[PDB]
Amino acid sequence: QDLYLRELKDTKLAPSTLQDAEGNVKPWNPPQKPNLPELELQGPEALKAYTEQNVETAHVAKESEEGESEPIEEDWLVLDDAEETKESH
Amino acid sequence: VSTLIPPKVVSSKNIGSAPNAKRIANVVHFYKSLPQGPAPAIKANTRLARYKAKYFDGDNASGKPLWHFALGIIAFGYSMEYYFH
């Protein structure tokens, strides 16, 4: 009946321009467009960090080297220190 | 920083330890030692060899030699105290 149809029609006048269409909004003085799709579109990345973890910064892992590939000055010293330990061992 | 390696450093460590000092001592004390009483030289032959095998050996080691000495004085009765002072 009509009293539901007219409020169903009312759903096709007041909120039809709200989200069903993009005719901004008549009852509201503040606009609907420059909040969610431009200011709050970056809103999720205005809550998290930008240009570091949304870009995600796929960074090359810092490379770690061996013991400088210099065995002679330490292996014999370790061998000399191994003599010291095994006397105490 | 790496795998330490003191499991195998005794090639130069077996010199300073105290038992090694005794080790190098008694091994020299062993090789030349006679095995089973060898070279005892039980056959003594020097002048009075018979005396060396009866009493001078030391198995008896009693008053027999002084008894022999005393009997020698007895047998010299008419040589020292008789026919002489």
Write out chain B residues lying below 8 Å of A79, CB-based: 5, 9
The answer for residues whose C-beta is within 8 angstroms of residue A26's C-beta and 6 or more apart is A14, A17
B76 to B51, B63, B64, B66: CA distances (angstroms): 21, 20, 18, 15
The answer for residues whose C-beta is within 8 angstroms of residue B44's C-beta and 6 or more apart is B52, B53, B57
Chain A touched by B4 (CB under 8 Å)? yes
Instruction: Output the 3-class SS for chain B.
Output: CCCCCCCCCCCCCCCCCHHHHHHHHHCCCCCCCCCCCCCCCCCCCCCCHHHHHHCCCCCCCCCHHHHHHHHHHHHCHHHHHCCCC
The answer for residues whose C-beta is within 8 angstroms of residue A87's C-beta and 6 or more apart is B13, B16, B17
* Radius of gyration of chain A from its Cα atoms, rounded to whole angstroms: 36
The answer for residues whose C-beta is within 8 angstroms of residue B12's C-beta and 6 or more apart is A83
Closest Cα to residue A88, out of B6, B3, B5, B4?
B6
Q: How was this structure determined?
A: cryo-EM
Closest Cα to residue B5, out of A69, A86, A70, A72?
A86
**For residues B56 and B38, what is the distance between their CA atoms, to the nearest angstrom?**
22
B2 vs A67: CB contact, 8 Å cut-off? yes
The answer for residues whose C-beta is within 8 angstroms of residue B61's C-beta and 6 or more apart is B55
**Which chain A residues in 15-74 lie under 8 Å from chain B, judged by CB atoms?**
67
Chain A touched by B15 (CB under 8 Å)? no
Q: What is the DSSP letter of A17?
A: I
Name the residue of chain A whose CA is nearest to B13's CA.
A83
Resolution of the solved structure (Å) = 4.2
Helix (H) or strand (E) holding A79: helix A72-88
The token pair that represents B65 in the structure block: 């030699």
CB–CB contacts below 8 A, A to B: 23
B22 to A10, A47, A62, B29: CA distances (angstroms): 113, 81, 58, 10
**For residues A65 and A60, what is the distance between their CA atoms, to the nearest angstrom?**
15
B16 vs A87: CB contact, 8 Å cut-off? yes
Amino acid symbol at A86: K
Tell me how close the Cα of A38 comes to any Cα of chain B, in angstroms: 54
